[PDB]
Nucleic acid binder design. Sequence first.
DNA 1: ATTGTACGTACAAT
DNA 2: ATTGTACGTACAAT
DNA 3: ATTGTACGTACAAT
DNA 4: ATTGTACGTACAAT
Lengths: 405, 405
Amino acid sequence: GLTYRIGNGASVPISNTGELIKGLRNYGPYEVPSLKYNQIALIHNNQFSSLINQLKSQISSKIDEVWHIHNINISEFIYDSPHFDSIKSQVDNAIDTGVDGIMLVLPEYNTPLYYKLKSYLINSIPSQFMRYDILSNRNLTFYVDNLLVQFVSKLGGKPWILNVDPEKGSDIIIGTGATRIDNVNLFCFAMVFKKDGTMLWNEISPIVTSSEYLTYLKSTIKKVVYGFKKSNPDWDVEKLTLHVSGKRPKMKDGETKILKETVEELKKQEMVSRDVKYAILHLNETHPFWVMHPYEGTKVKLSSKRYLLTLLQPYLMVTPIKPLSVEIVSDNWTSEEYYHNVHEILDEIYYLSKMNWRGFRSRNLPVTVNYPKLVAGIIANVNRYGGYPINPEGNRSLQTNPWFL
Amino acid sequence: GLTYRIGNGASVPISNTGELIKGLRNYGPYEVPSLKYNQIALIHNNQFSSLINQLKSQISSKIDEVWHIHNINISEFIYDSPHFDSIKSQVDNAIDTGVDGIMLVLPEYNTPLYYKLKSYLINSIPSQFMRYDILSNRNLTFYVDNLLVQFVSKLGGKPWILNVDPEKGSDIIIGTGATRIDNVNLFCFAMVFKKDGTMLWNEISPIVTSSEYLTYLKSTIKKVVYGFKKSNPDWDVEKLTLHVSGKRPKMKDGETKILKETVEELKKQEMVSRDVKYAILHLNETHPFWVMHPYEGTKVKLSSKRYLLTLLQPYLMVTPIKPLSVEIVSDNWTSEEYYHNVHEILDEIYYLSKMNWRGFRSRNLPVTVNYPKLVAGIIANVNRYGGYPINPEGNRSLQTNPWFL
DNA sequence: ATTGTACGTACAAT
DNA sequence: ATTGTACGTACAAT
DNA sequence: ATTGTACGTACAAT
DNA sequence: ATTGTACGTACAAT
Ligand SMILES: [Cl-]
Ligand SMILES: [Cl-]
Ligand SMILES: [Mg+2]
Ligand SMILES: [Mg+2]
């Protein structure tokens, strides 16, 4: 069945972390990140610690041997006290020396300090946080293994992509919708993906009130298609799918009407093909249930437009299911192609549920739903603890890299 | 897996009508009905019709050769006009000669006449109706084949029973609840079954208003247990299950409270064992869905007390499911036996979904739910068109035979 | 904040 | 009393 | 009323 | 326009 494509034309089976890691060592990742300085800063307050030295050695050898990123040096920067100003001084010191990314070790749980520093770094340079007190109580091998998956991704590398039939499925999938941060405030999102699970462009709205939802939903989607088209100017999108998700205002028929208008305007502006075939889907995580591989990829039809994908819960009697409801709220398909297109979009959602660059283990949740949830967590908490605002507009690094992992 | 037990200790696979019919011819039914007169009346208004003669010959030879009911003679009675009084004269003439049952051919669709005659016959003698205009447009072989399944059952025979492990499942299952006949009026029902799918006793309430529901629900259940116990005086019920169904007043917590009281009173009166283990289940047919034998008998857990059985739709791309929701609203099981008992009651419901004496083909709906629906259809329409009331109390034939098929 | 489970013991609601 | 959460700690993952 | 499907064409609701 | 019913006729079942 489905496989992951890594480097040198090799592919490895899904649902098998051991073979994925082994394949990376043999063949490299799908794309090794391009770096300016070949330099990574490690920033901590545990100078001469043995654990810091063990961590640095594993990072160094695995960046070389697993990720095939050669000639990297790691520089150390020591902050004197675990507070914002003292750590920020060392972050700025690291940036001044010329580094491709920062790995920042914090001593303990500290939510305001974390989100203030994280929002500063997201606006500055690819970064990876670590907790020393958790690091001290973990298998270092597993810790660094998965750590490097998302750090390499943050640096712009592509660890692996989905091996999918290039003749089936959408040209692009737009994950879009909004996420509430409280009873009144929200932000809209729109993320463009290839059918192989790679993210091409990201846009998010400013935080606004629910009264402004549909205005900013349309504008955020137009902005992400503009950015996708400018960065991919020869791509003619003839097969388009919207994956709408997020806890958002209940305005279903008004929202569908606006999403349809948006697609039509983008056709008018020739941002997608004038003959584009599209569908607008609602993706909702529903209540889990338990059957007391027969359901790996099973598709359930509830009505002509409501479907259910029985995604397996990652777990260690009963088989747990994490179902995903998929409703077709709008499409321009003909009756003759309709159920062929239903199978294709459902298979596509299943494939995308296997993409996750946070770590080696699949999340079994489509990236079009999962990655906005990660973004929501950061935007909400940066707002709550008053960090630096994150505005990907005008910042190509934020528009194209998975800074939210 | 599951098999049907027929005569002479033989058993045949489920879901295979051809082998079931062949097994009956070779081994006979599980129980051949006992008859007083060895005489069946055929009552029609098509004297000397060739089709009537073909029908009579198939009935005669199959009663002999498939059902192993020997030495039967069929007498004919001719009514002159298709009206109640003229047909009733021939029904009474048939009864006066001494017959074990009546087969009554009506010329066409006529709902008032059908239910007036049917309610008269149900109060008199086992009976089987037929429509001449439909009979003329059918494969006579298939028509008579299934016709005789339910006629033999109405005469008190047992065509086949479920082959079930005698050490698993309930001692008796009581199908109970109520069915609305309009927005205000209803009747309660209670049917006692063995785990092999045979009905032991039946009681129904008079038609009452919804305000009287819980009073008559309790009294109808007590009445059916009294009748089961009087007819089965050495049976010690230590494993009891209630299957509650029917479109009825929304009084869930009050209904559960009364059903629990009923079981406790019956324990007090020593109608069941004082150490009886029981569960009270709600069985609801839910919305069908389609998977786009992997679900023959599949059990889904939704919560600790809510389950789903994915019963297959009988049908001729997508696999249709007719799910059955099963909720445990009350039980006296211990925590240690609980999930063992959940599997047993769910398997038991699945087995009972294979019992259907209306014809050879399974209905894939548990008899504890299906047979009350058949009763509801008759009671409602006899009320609507003012036929003779059907009161099984005091009438052992109505309390023990499946007159509703 | 590598991430995710699994599972005690609490306490929340009815 | 009973049933869903809730919040810790434990620790698995290749 | 042997029963049950499957499926046109209508019309019902939005 | 679009999507669920609805009510006929057709006819399958072994
Ligand atoms: Cl569970
Ligand atoms: Cl369908
Ligand atoms: Mg991260
Ligand atoms: Mg019948």
